[PDB]
From a paper:
Here we identify the bacterial esterases, GloB and FrmB, that activate carboxy ester prodrugs in Staphylococcus aureus. To establish the structural basis for FrmB and GloB substrate specificity and enable future structure-guided prodrug therapeutic design, we solved the three-dimensional structures of both S. aureus FrmB and GloB. FrmB and GloB have distinct ester substrate specificities, which are supported by the structures of their active sites. Additionally, the finding that mutation in either frmB or gloB is sufficient to confer POM-HEX resistance suggests that the two enzymes may work in concert to bioconvert POM-HEX into HEX.
Author numbering:
A (entry chain B): -2 to 251
B (entry chain A): -8 to 164, 176 to 251
The structure:
């Protein structure tokens, strides 16, 4: 089992500026044989939080080692703070992550089947994960929010830069009951009979978001949305996300 | 889903384990951002592709740093593949007789995993110094794979291999362009269109004049472009600009 480690710098049409991506691509024998078709890989979209970039999971966890064991391609895009609340509709975080998805599935040998595509992330990346699970449920078979932001008030506790923080403060009164509120997205997804990915939700018991995580899964239980929840000792850091992403990858592929 | 306006390149660094040499190797790939790559509802448009071979004083980043090749390739919507063929890697490939195998492996791998045209008319090869020697060898033994070949300031023997502080054991431890040329002409093999370049102050200028004289006598067509320049990236920057324009037109 071998992996190709890829760094990609490209101009993003959605954001309108350059963005970096990390891609780890398992080596498959079909990729070296010019006479056979490529065998498409299972693929995880992995979303970092506000103190990270496209290199942090590589540096602060052993994710590549876990992915190599399970022959899992992983896509780690850079996410700028301004993507979440400073951009116009159509040019925001949501659109950008879907652009990354489309681009890497066009240019790399990644499966396009729902059963072969997963999404995961922590903190604001866990907010991203649950938003994509509830709006792009036909795209991802499984979703793993880690130490996730589920509530509007959580947003004021985070490490936003100055320009993004000003947009967060200025639009806070507009989050609840909109497409930016995970609870609203959840209620809507059920109503439109949308596919919801299988959910594995994880949080450490010392995390400042732990109780809001319990509140979210309690609501899931009350509206009969299936999920698995795993907790244990751990805080809001990569010592926990290293352990959690190892467990998540095993769960995803099996 | 939004698609690029105008011409942009993706800059890609790839590290992969090579089945051929059983070692990890770096590649640089510059890949045009074609609109089809951002539209999930269309088939990808395969791109014209250059395999570019650096010399023994370089690595897979040197062309990026010491020329403006990416700017030239962006203008002409050309994908460029720059494998590491550095001095230690080449020494291992030459000893194990795996150099052809490695470059062919790189070719096959990038055409499998990236949206690169597999048609001969869309595939080119180029390189300078020992990479020009390599370009000539691939032109004469793999003429069916490349429509065009551009040797820059080529050497015609692998003596530069010895220009490292090898120990005596390593020093002591069909690769002739002219033999390969005779063979290709005798057997009526396909030879790519040839653009041969060398600067007039290069120590290798006379060796290149000797080679094109032999191509004339043996009736192999070519274009030869020369001018002021020495054996350096000031020359290769200008030469690869010209080569890329020639390749894609
Ligand atoms: Mg973070
Ligand atoms: Mg965060
Ligand atoms: Mg050389």
């Amino acid at each position: 089992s071998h992996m190709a480690y890829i760094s990609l710098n490209y101009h993003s049409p959605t954001i309108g500026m350059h963005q970096n991506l990390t891609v780890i691509l398992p080596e498959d024998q079909s990729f070296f044989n010019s006479d056979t078709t490529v065998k498409p890989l299972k693929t995880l979209m992995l979303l970092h939080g506000l103190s990270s970039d496209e290199t942090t999971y590589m540096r602060y966890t052993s994710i590549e080692r876990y992915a190599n064991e399970h022959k899992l391609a992983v896509i780690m895009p850079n996410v700028d703070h301004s993507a979440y609340a400073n951009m116009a509709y159509g040019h925001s975080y949501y659109d950008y992550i879907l652009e990354v998805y489309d681009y890497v599935h066009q240019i790399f040998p990644l499966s396009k089947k729902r059963d072969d595509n997963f999404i995961a992330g922590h903190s604001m990346g866990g907010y991203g994960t649950i938003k994509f699970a509830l709006t792009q449920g036909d795209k991802f078979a499984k979703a793993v929010p880690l130490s996730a932001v589920f509530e509007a008030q959580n947003l004021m506790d985070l490490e936003w830069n100055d320009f993004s923080k000003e947009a967060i403060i200025g639009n806070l009164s507009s989050v609840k009951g909109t497409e930016h509120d995970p609870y609203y997205l959840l209620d809507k997804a059920v109503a439109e009979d949308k596919q919801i990915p299988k959910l594995l939700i994880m949080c450490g018991k010392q995390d400042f978001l732990y109780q809001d995580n319990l509140d979210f899964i309690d609501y899931l239980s009350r509206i009969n949305v299936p999920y698995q929840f795993e907790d244990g000792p751990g805080d809001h850091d990569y010592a926990y996300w290293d352990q959690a992403i190892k467990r998540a990858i095993t769960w995803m592929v099996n």
